[PDB]
């Protein structure tokens, strides 16, 4: 999970 987004 660490560091990971859904929307850029």
């Amino acid at each position, epitope marked *: *999970a*660490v*560091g*990971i*987004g*859904a*929307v*850029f």
Partner: antibody
Amino acid sequence: VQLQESGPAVMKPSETLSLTCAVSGGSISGDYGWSWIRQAPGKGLEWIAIIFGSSGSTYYSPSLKSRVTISKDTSKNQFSLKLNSVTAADTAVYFCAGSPVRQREQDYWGQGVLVTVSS
Amino acid sequence: SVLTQPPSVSAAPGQKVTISCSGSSSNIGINYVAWYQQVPGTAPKLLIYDSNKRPSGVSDRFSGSKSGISASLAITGLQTGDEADYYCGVWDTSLTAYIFGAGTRLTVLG
């Protein structure tokens, strides 16, 4: 995936801190995000930067962006951090971490290296 | 931190504890929330990912959810071994940065 940090235990103010994370059991240029994180003694976790293995895109803590470099090396299967102009405020345990971009139930952390900045 | 969580929470053994993290529509609103358990200065352990999923190996006394711009970790059947620091973590689309909450120190009363 396993991560191992390495870096200096002690540094003088104004120097450039340079850290490396050796990655094994996955490909540095696979579908991962590779982060650096730090924790000053007795304080909270602070994310510093990430580099994505597939694209090479990088993102940074707004408050640290002006002083930090994050890089990856495919031949070496590693990624690295540079933080310049350190002060005592940069004394912290520095962790390398990683996560698959899609399989986010997986979470990889190094055990952390203490970096002390002192004159 | 643009995410706010209480600095401390306390409850008696066996009770249900909730730790909440308040953010914005740009982080908690639209991105994956993760919850980490930590002893200070050592690697944190992922408890919840994708706001409400538990990884294999984590006790089912731990659960998570989010609603709007707020997210919550719930610990049922509190044990003294649950004393630790708890961090929410989430991407902020508008800052293009990953953000941890300031941390909540959990004390087990009695």
